[PDB]
């Protein structure tokens, strides 16, 4: 039509497996599974994978799109190693890591330590930068925000941990 999804290679490391519905993948990165919906019928010839809609039911066809993509990311994650980094701006704001507990000195009375789930560590190349990186893109996303969420940037200044991309310059001029 103008959209769909058909490709999903299985290079080295890509040790995909299906158990009726379940799909466990392996590789240089980690062990990620993701039992899709029920109708789902994914397989694997030698390289291309393919979702399986029990039939052309409304909530059954589109269920393919969201699927042929999720697994694909599982592959793109396991082979590349996912990264995403945010930056902290504002006086006093600092950064630090000690394995998991990424101590955070933002601007409250006492600093904190966000313990990241397993599969994604983080590194502060400086007291200003934090670069998280792991396999599963899921835990990646939530923790990406779960972190910046500790202090969302405010317009008047911009201060507050922001994704290292956020267009938000600053405010609309103040007033009263």
């Amino acid at each position: 039509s103008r959209v769909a999804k058909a490709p999903v290679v299985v290079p080295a490391g890509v040790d995909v497996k299906i158990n009726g519905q379940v799909i466990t993948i392996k590789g240089k990165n980690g062990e990620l599974t993701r039992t899709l919906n029920d109708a789902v019928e994914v397989k694997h010839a030698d390289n291309t994978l393919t979702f399986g809609p029990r039939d052309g039911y409304a909530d059954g066809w589109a269920q393919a799109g969201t699927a042929r993509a999720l697994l694909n990311s599982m592959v793109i994650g396991v082979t590349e190693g996912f990264t995403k980094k945010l930056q902290l701006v504002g006086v006093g704001y600092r950064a630090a890591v000690k394995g998991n507990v990424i101590n955070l000195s933002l601007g409250f009375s006492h600093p904190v330590d966000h313990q990241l789930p397993a599969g994604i560590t983080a590194e502060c190349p400086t007291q200003t930068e934090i670069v998280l990186k792991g396999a599963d893109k899921q835990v990646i996303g939530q923790v990406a925000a779960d972190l910046r969420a500790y202090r969302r940037p405010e317009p008047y200044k911009g201060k507050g941990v922001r994704y290292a991309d956020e267009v938000v310059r600053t405010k609309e001029a103040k007033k009263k």
């Binding site: 317009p155 267009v167 938000v168 310059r169 405010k171 609309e172």
Partner: protein
């Protein structure tokens, strides 16, 4: 502001106005400006 009924949407860059019925004119991609569901 976040309205109750429906005040259309106006502007261009406003949200696709798609979701669970969320109109509110504003035009997102206005770092500060953000008239919407609330």
């Amino acid at each position: 502001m976040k309205v109750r009924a429906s005040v259309k949407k106006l502007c261009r860059n406003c949200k696709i106005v798609k979701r669970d019925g969320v109109i509110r004119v504003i035009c997102s991609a206005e770092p500060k400006h953000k008239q919407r569901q609330g």
